[PDB]
Amino acid sequence: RKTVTWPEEGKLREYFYFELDETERVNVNK
Amino acid sequence: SLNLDSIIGRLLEVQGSRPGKNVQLTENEIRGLCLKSREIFLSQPILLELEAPLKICGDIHGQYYDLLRLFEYGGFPPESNYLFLGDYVDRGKQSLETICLLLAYKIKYPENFFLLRGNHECASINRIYGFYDECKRRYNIKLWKTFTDCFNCLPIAAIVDEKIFCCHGGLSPDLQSMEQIRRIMRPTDVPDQGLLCDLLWSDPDKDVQGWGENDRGVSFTFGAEVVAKFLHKHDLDLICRAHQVVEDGYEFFAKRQLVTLFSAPNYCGEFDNAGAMMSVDETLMCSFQILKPAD
Ligand SMILES: [Mn+2]
Ligand SMILES: [Mn+2]
């Protein structure tokens, strides 16, 4: 039987950064 | 006669291209994806019973290259087990590539890859918000209706190791027993009210105590006390849902009793949000992997 736990706050988030293309994301309804 | 690996190969082929390339599968290949995934959806429970370790993702909304980034960082199947919480189509530029890759991975790894239904996996909604227009432009109307028949068989919720309850929207005032979910027959549309509607449409709200009216004009809001009572009654530790854009890609509610996930960074070019994925290890220790454009 398992239980939900959380790590130390320093290890809660792992970041991945990528190059931003300003034309990659569009709302097709606009 | 479905050449699954060729399809997946062509879908992943466009990784790292600039400007972002479309992947135009054949009509028969896409219909094959819909038909085979539909069979698997129906053969598996509408209320999934899953086991950790796995990674859980929120909305994608046709941001295909962001989906590729998610797999790139979280590990392409079957390196990691995945559960997606819905809203794969609409708004973004590449709903077709998005849903096709997801359906392909479902067929390829049916025991390690799972897709829940979001409120946009519904004909009355995605006819309007982009998916139908994309289908009509790049294929035909008949293909859109094939997608709808497939979407109507998607599972609605998942429980991870009997402790994490997962769905797109949230809780329902009509949800007394999990059997009520299990009793829902497929194929089905999403009704404008009731249990199935709420599971795909409701939101948490910090200012409401019990149940309140939802600004969306559909379903309800629910407060922290509702979450607490739900978890205690069903012996759960956590609610994992999506359905709302959050700045850091994830966001806690009611002292970490609920988490909202949103996996589409810079949502439809109008927000500066990060996208997040929740990594759940074998012991159900949960952490977040965060997708963010560099600045
Ligand atoms: Mn959404
Ligand atoms: Mn939604």
In DSSP notation, B169-223 reads S---TT-S-THHHHT--SS----SSSHHHHHHH-EE-TT-SSEEE-TTSSSEEE-
Q: Known catalytic residues of B? A: 120
Q: How many domains does chain A have?
A: 1
Q: Would you call B108 exposed, middle or buried from its count of C-beta atoms within 10 A (0-12, 13-18, 19+)? A: middle
| B270 neighbourhood in chain A, CB within 8 Å | 27
The technique by which this structure was obtained is X-ray
| A23 neighbourhood in chain B, CB within 8 Å | 19
Domain that holds residue A23: 1-30
Resolution expressed in Å: 2.1
At residue B44, the 3 state secondary structure works out as coil
Ligand 2 centre to CA of B88 (Å) is: 9
Q: Would you call B111 exposed, middle or buried from its count of C-beta atoms within 10 A (0-12, 13-18, 19+)? A: exposed
- Residue B258: what are its φ and ψ, rounded to 5°? -140, 145
Contact predicate B216/B209, CB 8 Å: no
CB–CB contact B283 A5 (8 Å): yes
Chain B residues 154-193 within an 8 A CB cutoff of chain A? 161-164
Q: Report yes or no: B283 at the A interface, CB cutoff 8 Å.
A: yes
Ligand 1 centre to CA of B68 (Å) is: 18
Look up residue B1 and give its DSSP letter: -
Tokens of B246: 């959050």
Q: Give me the domains of chain B, ranges plus CATH numbers.
A: 1-295 (3.60.21.10)
* Binding site as annotated, residues of B: 59, 61, 87, 119, 168, 243
